[model samples]
Target chain A: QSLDIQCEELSDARWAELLPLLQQCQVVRLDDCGLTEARCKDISSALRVNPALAELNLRSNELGDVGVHCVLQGLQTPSCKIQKLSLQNCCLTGAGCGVLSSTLRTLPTLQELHLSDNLLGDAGLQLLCEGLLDPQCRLEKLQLEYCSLSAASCEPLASVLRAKPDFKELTVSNNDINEAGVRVLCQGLKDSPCQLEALKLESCGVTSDNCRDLCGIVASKASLRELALGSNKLGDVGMAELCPGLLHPSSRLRTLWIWECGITAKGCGDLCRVLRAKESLKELSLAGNELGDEGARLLCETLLEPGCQLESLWVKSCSFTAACCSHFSSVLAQNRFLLELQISNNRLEDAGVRELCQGLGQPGSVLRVLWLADCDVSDSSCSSLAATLLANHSLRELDLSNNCLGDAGILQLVESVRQPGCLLEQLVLYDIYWSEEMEDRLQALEKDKPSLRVIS
Target chain B: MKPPQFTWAQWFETQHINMTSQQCTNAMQVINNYQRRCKNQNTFLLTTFANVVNVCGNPNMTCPSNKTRKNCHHSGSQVPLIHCNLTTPSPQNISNCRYAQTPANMFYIVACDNRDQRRDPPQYPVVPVHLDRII
Candidate 1:
């Protein structure tokens, strides 16, 4: 539950003395633990039988592959059931992988593994995959984030997972697989029906084809969820390819995030069509996409569909305007199933906002959060919104921070909170014009406005 | 205005992780914090480094070569109040700003310019809040 004793050295004879007594403890973290091949056996021997021990972190240590072997040998004993292990920056190489593989067979209960930022190239990874593919391997998650693996490297991993299918989450991000390695991964997914979830391939040269393949994988799989393909080369065609894949019958994919994949309004038609058809997708993040008014309007039509079950539609920094707002009014009115609609950082002044309020008023609408920051809404927008509060009761949270709404507008918005149907609970009016008079006005309004909660 | 914090989350997002979320944020925070100080002190960071020029009524005085400074026509010409310089090897987000052999994820700010190196342990260390020291 808690930790004491500040770690001063990487690891010295000082820690060697504490090893026996430390065995009584469950966790032992010796970051920058200057342990060498010499101390590996001793420290490993001491760590082997530490009963309560679940995790032992040796981050930034002097231990190399040889040291790793000795340590593994010590922990490989059956009595040692240490589950979580961190060997980050431990001077591991291909030889160390051989040691790690043979050693992992001993500890059957190991669940979380962190082997990131090491120079473990193809050979090392293959050796490690040996233990991973083992039918008895109990590891639920594996983190090889930036451990240098390629398409050639992925072959071993693909084989391991395809054959055994035990790991629930495997993080091998920051590896250059190009399309070949990525395709290899998707191909392996075709075999396994395990509960594999959360694959992060941030920038592995993934273009439209991989998007197409993976979207197919998600659409087909019933258990797979949370696919993060950010920083990949998934451009407009790539995003479009995913649309049809998302609409598959076996769709269990709830969250489809394609952030910063160079998506634009160019593919919004495809995306909107796909999203509208996909009733299972809960959170669809297309952030950093260049969605213009035309592109957004393409998606807006789907948002209005009564069958559309979207939860959050994040399209920040996308081109927007009052023109876009006119389209949103109908969708917002069609009875909202969504909760959060982030339309910030666009120039959608009062005209656009007045349009959205119409949909917000609908009683059947499930819309709860509305973020209208930096939409260029001044006093006029504020007063118009206040008037909506008089009738709209379902809306719970509204973020108008950094909207540049002047004092008069805030006053009017606060005044409208007095309406009986106005059940606004969480209101953010930060970074707006708030003088002393505004504070007094909020206080006076609070007496009569029980539903209003303004955070200035 | 101070730039927003944290641009990229993955290394593939940029050629190099030259800026961490905290460093960029701290740099902007430092900039924003100093903007307040600049207003109080009546000093401008950009103006101190460089300035633009305006000719007087004569319309004969040409603009200054620097963009941050304003020109004085009749009386005294204005000189820059401060100078700007970026010390190379200044650890940005890309840790191991030195040679490739340096270290991965080892980023530290060089408080002083490289020109100031010979001066008694040149770079001062100001460990900003929201950082782990990377032990």
Candidate 2:
């Protein structure tokens, strides 16, 4: 069932030679093969006869309209039993979707279709949705990221979601499907026969105004689990509206990524309120927001809540400092379940890390991954951090890149990792200013320890 | 009787018929592995070598009672040339052949197509282009 070939060396001659072997195989991956129109036809001829081929990945090939159409022609022959077809970056346009749509009507077993980074415009999607709307279609997961779509594709997409009961996962990111498109699509998500689970609408020009309708989808749909609304301007007001649905007892939404959603400190307080109420919310990523010290304080307050069982928190680039670190340090001192705290890209200097050290030194802190990269740290903070490393047994990975931590700072960490009780597995020191002697010291220490990976 | 001294030309000539299907597959596997290493390391292995005098494949020097020019796959494109670095134990993966390892036995013909004595290895290897033309 494994069609793992040397993709760079794959040619028509080699393909022809392996036809006998491939015909009986279940999985066929012929990606990055400079397959021309003729070679596409050759593979199509092979696919028609292949008995057990269930998964086909022809990604990163020059499969133009003719090539894709040729492959679809083979799939049309009911004997071809491919359930998943990934044709990403295949130079395909709307010219090929007509055949693909018709073939989808014939193939009942097809479940997953990944057509990311292609030129399959609205027309192509419309053609494909027509097949999806058919009662016999069993398509469950459809991913079409960056397919040059716009609002014109929303109606058919909504129809597909409402009609295809089994259609659960949908990722249509990096297109121009703005608020109006989202508003229309939310109608299908809110309505009947939609068992959608995961939905990603990142960077589709969605504004704060669309959150009300999206909230309706979250509050009404119990099956929806993961919702990623990153890279949009869903400001504090937008997030405020969304939190009401997340706080609703009926909301089963688990993983939420509102990164770069134009949300400020004003929003996270409400986000914190929602985090305190929603027992289902586990993973929360508020990265890329300008949630300054006050915002981090609000999130930290939520983390300190005895009822908050959130596992991972990513607050990258959310304007923070020593004051915010002090707030989080208190949370670390008490919280036992929060495993990962990614506060990278914030200017949390030596003072901030020194404040964090007091909490990390606490035995109650079970934090596994603490990312503090580009945090403007220095040698003055390393002594306190060394004490934390020596005490804390649960911390596994510590990324301290983009700092000028001299030999003394690194020496503190080297000494701590050598400690018998320290369970630190990975320490990143990329671009840290250190001496050659310290480098040799860390190298020799790594050789002696053999467990800790010091990425210098 | 002694495995024909394990010569490169012998393997090239009899590989299609003397070996099983598994051996052919293994040869391609070796070529694929070597090609990946070459790409990663930015180094190439020169498999076949020809001297500065003449064409690499000589049909007159054929095996006794066997198909002359059994090396039909390596279509002899005898250009009036010098320093013809021909390779052997030819792997069918044409792309991988760019990084094929040089075999033990390397042969040359003293017969010269052009008496220019100019050490011409062409602007690039013509053997690859001939193999690619099969597609």
Candidate 3:
């Protein structure tokens, strides 16, 4: 039912063979397959005949406005049942948006539209919003990241927000939408009846001044589950400002990503309080911040609390050292809800990892993913990790990339993984200087155990 | 300690070329243990590795050769095979694959490699490299 021909430039004969298969497949992903405008008609014809095709992803293909127009003609057919369409990086422009806008108004079944990395500027978004304003248009998710949008685009998007109750996700990351743009958008969200679930504004030139409006949206929208404000200039003051809404009784946020927001120990205090109070916040990312040992320790203490329902915690490159490892180890041992911990790019040396391994060996530990990439580990800590692997069957993914774990260390891990009842699925050892012989050994191990993937 | 070798014999052992019994669990195991991503459907010949490799020796059933490998060969007679079709499409985890096994009698084609230097035990001069097709 699913045909994925990604990254392969198919021949004419191969395309002819694939056209017949598309008639029955429910999902087709042909990303980066060198598809151009000429092949769109054939794909359109296939779409005309196919009633079961629900999703079509032609990402990274050079199907420009003309090709997309041709595909839209196929979508116009009554027999076509495509729901999710991704034309990401397909060289689309404002002209293509006009065609897509018409399709949006016509195709009621079209739910998710991913038009990221296209040159759909403010005018194009305005035209697209017009279609979204139609009662027949039922797009639930719209991804417009890196679509050359500006503050002017937000006004049109606000209107779409007010008009469409089905619109739940709006990702406009990497656009030039400053704090003023977000303010206008938040105004629309306040007035709109639409229950937006996810809103991503990463690298959108958002500052600390914008958090007030963002906090209002967080507090007001009870259905808001995910809010990504990564790569913004929101420092300690901004994080503190946003905490009021995050601590609101009505807020039911599940995922909050504030990575690279210039946060430190001062901001961690407020976040710790949020973690202690909000049991619904399951996934949090404070990666790329300057949350040093003290900041990490405060967060770890809150995570140790039984009320914290955080399942995934990302503290990568938070200026952590071996001093904070013991606190995280305590969290790993105590926190039953925490499953994934990414502490990559820290200075957690052999001693630090050894202590964390101790926590992993504890019976109460339920950490599934442990990412320790670029943590200055070596062969010294590998034996301890191998020992923990034997003890902990819950640890599924372990990434020790960019470390100096030598042949001896890798072999020890291989032996441990080969043991019965050890359910390690993915072991990433990228950029580690392992020998060709060791690579051969890992391949042989994978042949023996097909479930395990050793990415060296 | 020496590293494990992934020769033709080892491949045969892991690929379940000599399954004495057939079950859905065995089908799921073979699919889970596949070298790459889980296939939508895979067929295992219900015969010994030696018997399958002898298909390459059949002079009358020779197929066209390719640039990388020697000429392919097809079984002269229909062989008993078990087809494992995936019940769930695009499973989240390849390890958690579920399959429906069905027994069939079909003619199968296999590609043979004559450069036998890498073969373990050096028993066979030519070994089957791929399960080409079933007709």
Candidate 4:
């Protein structure tokens, strides 16, 4: 069941050869298949009669306006049962969105529509607003990431939010929709009784200018649980302004991703306070931010707070060292709620992770996933990690990629997995310094324990 | 207690709503003869194929009438999928096998590969070997 049926880079002949078979599937993934108008004509024919077809993914294909038009013509039939369609990077235009908007009115079963990486500008978005605002349309999730949108598109999209109360998730990341656009969007949300659950706007020319408006929206709605504003310049002031809404009792926010948002140790104080106070906060991703050892210490202290319920924390490439390892180890030993801790691409070298494992062996440790890729780890750290594996009962996935875990360290990990009740499921060792004998040892160990997937 | 055998005449009358009684009578004889002699009856379940109309049209096309056609002849490429469960089907019917390529595992076939000839092909030309076999 884990095995997916993916068809990629197929010749027009080959893609046509498989259209009928692909149509019958519940999930059809045809990425990078050089599909054109003629091929889409055939695909449309197949789509019309496909009884159980639910998901159609056409990522990174050349399905231009004409091609999508052909497919939409096929979807006009009642027999076409496709529900989820992702056409990312399909070289489509506003004309295509017009057709897509019209087709949306016909497809009674469609719930998720992903059109990311297209050139669907404000004109295209206006066309889509017609179908989106249509009372009969059943679209619940929509993605228009990198779609050349700006402030002009926000009003129509906001109209969609107001019209479609069932709208759940929307992603408009990597666009040119700056603070002015978001403020307009917030205006629509404030006016309408919208029920948006998740929103992503990473690298969309965002800054601290509209943080107050965003905070107001976040505080007013408990339905907005997941918000991603990564790769923006929303620095300490914006984050501090945003924290009051995040820490509100009515706010049911769960996942907060603010990666590379100009956050430093100063911003970490506010974030750590939010972590300490909020029980609904579950996942936090702050990668690419220079949250130094002080920041790491603050986060660890917050994790040990009486009210902290954070389960997953990703602080990749944060400026940290051996100094914070002691704090992390103590917090990990005491905190029973933290399940996944990712500190990859940091300077958590041999001594830091070694000290960190001291807490991993303690009883009440429920940390399952530990990612430490490119952390300057060596053979000296593997023995402690091995012991941690043998002692910890909840550890499932351990990433040790881009390290110098030589044959000796590999042997230590192998021995740990061989021990009874060692619940390690996946061990990642990308580009490790290993000999031919180490490969043989890894192959034998993999055969003995098929559940333990060793990815090198 | 014995299971009830599907009575075709009663079912056909309901499904072929658009067809006249004369047309339905004519279509019933062809299906009755096809079902009785079919050795692959247990392997494949037969269903009536009818065109539906009066639904909303796409941006380009207009909606057809309420009186749709039964046994309407569409393009061969537009036929509903016929899932083949067995791999390496009956040698005579091997041409009907459609190979859909997934990156994880290639040379996977569920039914008929459309790469084959498709100029007004007969519906019964490619009788599938087994309906649902992975082996």
Candidate 5:
């Protein structure tokens, strides 16, 4: 009853071969299949009339507004119950947005809207939210991430976020709502009777100065749980300014992401000395920063500090050398609560990888997922990794993707999958060239380790 | 529970307005037979074949309805698509999609309603003429 439909890179003739399976689909996700208006005209009626559909994800299909215009006619029909509609990267313009917005006004039932990654600007967004703001509108969880939304459009959305009482999730990340835009949107948060549980403003250009107004709002609000402020230009000064609201006992903030916000080892000084004091903090993304080798060493030094509820850490591409690996490996090898350690795309190569592999192979290792993609690993690295994969049964996923692992290196990795004691359920070797024979070898791994799932 | 089936006159009246009852009758019989047999019915679905006039003009040509058949010329390729009384066919008839394409795009103008007679080939005939498919 559940299936993941994916047919990317298939030609029209190949699609003809798949038409029969398409007839039985429920969650059809079409990704870039050169669909045109004529094709939509031929297919829309059939897809609309089918009763099994729940989600139709049309991503990166070069369907101009005209093609979407045709598809919208089918969706607007009364004999359907489409729940999740994803038109991400469908080459939608303002005109196309206008058409679908007006059409959505008529449909009484649609929820979970994802309209991300396209050229739709504020004008088009206003057209869509016109329906979302309607008293008759039933949309609940809305995602408008990266739909060309400028800070100028925040007012209309601010109106909805303030006006609505039922919407639970609002994802507006990646649109640089600079300090000025944040000021305007905070006005809505200040006025609203909303139950906005999660607000993701990652990389939206709010500064350390705006943290004053932000702290006021968070302190005043009672419903927010996760505020993703990660990947911003906000510096150590911003965290210090925001720490007041963060330390408040009345605050419901459970997950804080100050990851890669232009921080330094001195910022680690802040987290180790101050932020780790919070009892409610559970997850954070401190990846992609210059937390150098000594800084990482010191952070690991405070691994067992009290009130530390940090369950996951994304320290990827943070300027850590092999000098800091031993400190992390020692803590991760024995920790009970740490679930994820993403040290990927960093300069953790050669000796660094082998050292980490030694600690990760210990049967007492509690880190369930290890991400070390592009850590300059090689065939020798796999021979070292085989010890951990063969011994550590608790770790569920291993990501060694994006490394310059050669063909024979990948063969040794596949050979690791043959180890009967290997308990890795997910092996991500992304960008690694696994030879034809290696693929056969990995497939044969299922006989030895039924839980093994290779991802290349 | 079903929509009414359209009559031959109903179907052709929209397309072959210039055709006589006799031409309609002949065309409908050939069309219905072809549709029933699942043959290539695009030409029939269209208006009368360009050579339609000749099928109906067979009379005047074989008879002295007029002074001279001097102006009449024919090519060897032109043949009666319907094979109905070619002896009285008109001298000129046309064929192919380039001419009319289908019944939808074609407009017809009948020259003569009905005149039945066996016609001989024109004197000093440069080429033999016959009815041809409607373009």
Candidate 6:
């Protein structure tokens, strides 16, 4: 049904062999396969013939304007029914935008287009907008992350948002789209009848000043589910400003990522209110913030609240310690909705982990994936962890990487893993200095039990 | 439930390295039924696992290939093996693959991993993870 050739250098002969077979494939992904203009003609031929082909991912190829031009020519064919095309990091520029614009207008079936990490500047985007604004254009999702876009590019993007009612997801992350650009975009979003579902603007030079406009969009768009504004200088004030929009009666936002947003315990207090109010909000990543023990405690208490329906929570590098571990333990025991908990890069030593293992072993605990990597874990905690592994069947993946879990600790875990009741699938122990005997024991354990993956 | 993890040991078992006859068929079988991919080249040692492990104890020479470097050990004694090379360019339907088998007594190179005590016959600490080359 699909032909996915990844990270393999294909010779002319190899390409020749694969060219004919492409007609049979419905989804083709030739990502990081050293593709160039030399093979564009062959790829184009396959596109022209392959009626079953729906998704084509040519990510990380050296396909420039000429190569893309060749490929788009085949997309114009009547037989081609391609729906999704990902040309991420294909060495594209302004010259290729015109051709892409033409293809967008020609192909009505094309719903998703990913052009991330391309050198498509404001001028290039302007050209592409011509087709995106066309009556024939029915694109639902467009990703232009890491594109050489600026405030100048916002006007045309705003125009597309206003014009296309079908446009749902737009990701323009890692661009220099400043507060002024966001204000302009928000204007178009407010005016448009389009129901945008997901919008990502990470590392886009957004400060506390931009949150008002962003909040306006958030409050307005009821269809919006995912909003990722990570790596912005939106401190506690910005977070507080955005809370009212998130707490809106119509707002059904599911995933919110505000990592490295200069939020502290004060900011988390406002977020806890949203967590308690919005049961629809499932995934939240407050990673890389300075949310110390107090902040973690606030979030954990909110998670334990019956009103909260959060499934996945990421608080990595938020300066957690043994003090907050008890709060998290309480959450593990009570919170049924929380599935994945990523609390990596903290100083949760053996004592902290012991508390977590106690909660994990409890009957009410349903946590699946727990990451405790670089938490200063030692051999002393392994016994309890092993005990928890035997008692808890829901825990599938347990990451204890960058820990000092020596032979004794590893042996205890291995013994538990060998037990019939233990349902642990992935055990990550990266950066641990393994002895020869311990390495062999782990190897032998893997040999004996094919179900468990001991990644050391 | 999730499927079992596919390790080098499981891969070695599927190799049927110590086969007595039908070198070409066995080579084709190994090529066709290889986990995830149809390898371009695979050398099946027509000898015991102990004999191969012994080569690691007193290797003739370290590999010149920088990727493997000191990890790869070359056999001093000539070992009997059937080297299978994939003839087909696009191996999508590998069952219909045409492989060229070269059966010869030659010096073999194998990349060995750290001691695996769980392996049967505990004295053989090392295990071959890769069949580097044949000279």
Maximum-DockQ candidate: 1
Model 5 chain A lDDT-worst window of ten: A1-10
lDDT of 2 by residue, B5-55 (tens): 322222222221121112122233332232221111011112233322113
Answer with 1 or 2, whichever has the higher TM-score.
Answer: 2
Please provide, for model 4 over A233-331, each residue's C-alpha lDDT reduced to its tens digit, 9 standing for 90 to 100: 999988998998898888989989887899999999998888888899998988778999999989998998898999888787788888899999998
Query: In model 6, how large is the Cα lDDT of residue B131?
Result: 58
Q: Candidate 3, residues A1-456: lDDT per residue as tens digits?
A: 888865467999999899887766899878667899999999888887887889988877888999988877878876566789998778899877888898887788888999987889999998889898888888999988779999999999998888888879999987999988988888988988889999988779888888888889999999999998888999998998899999999999999988889999999898889999999999898987999999988998888777899998888878999999999988888789998887887998999999999888888789998888778898889899989998987899887865766578778888888777679987876434334567677778877887787763
Model 1 per-residue lDDT tens digits across residues B1-135: 111232111111111222211122112212223112111001111221011111122222221221222221321233222211111111122111111111222221110111122322223221111110111
* Stretch of 10 with least lDDT, candidate 4 chain A: A1-10
Give the winner by DockQ: 3 or 6: 6
Which regions of candidate 4 fall more than 4 Å away from where they truly are? A1-4, A7-18, A32-38, A79-81, B1-135
Per lDDT, the best of the predicted structures is 6
DockQ per candidate: 0.04, 0.01, 0.02, 0.01, 0.01, 0.02
Per-residue C-alpha lDDT of model 6 across residues B55-101, encoded as one tens digit per residue: 76665455543332567787876977787543322234443333446
lDDT of 6 by residue, A278-380 (tens): 9999999898799999999999889888899999888877999988999999888888999989887789889999999999899878999888876878889
CAPRI quality level assigned to candidate 4 from its DockQ score:
incorrect
lDDT of 2 at A257: 79
Q: On residues A53-80, what C-alpha lDDT tens digit does candidate 1 reach at each position?
A: 7777775576887787777776766677
In model 2, the runs with Cα more than 4 Å from the true position are A1-54, A70-80, A418-421, A429-456, B1-135
Off by over 4 Å in 3: B1-135
The C-alpha local distance difference test score for the whole of candidate 3 amounts to: 0.78
List candidate 1 segments past 4 Å from native: A1-103, A112-127, A146-148, A193-195, A373-380, A384-397, A400-456, B1-135
Q: By the lDDT metric, which is better: model 3 or model 4?
A: 3
* Residue A423, candidate 6: alpha-carbon lDDT: 93
Give one digit per residue, the lDDT tens place, for model 2 in A379-404: 78889888899888889878786565
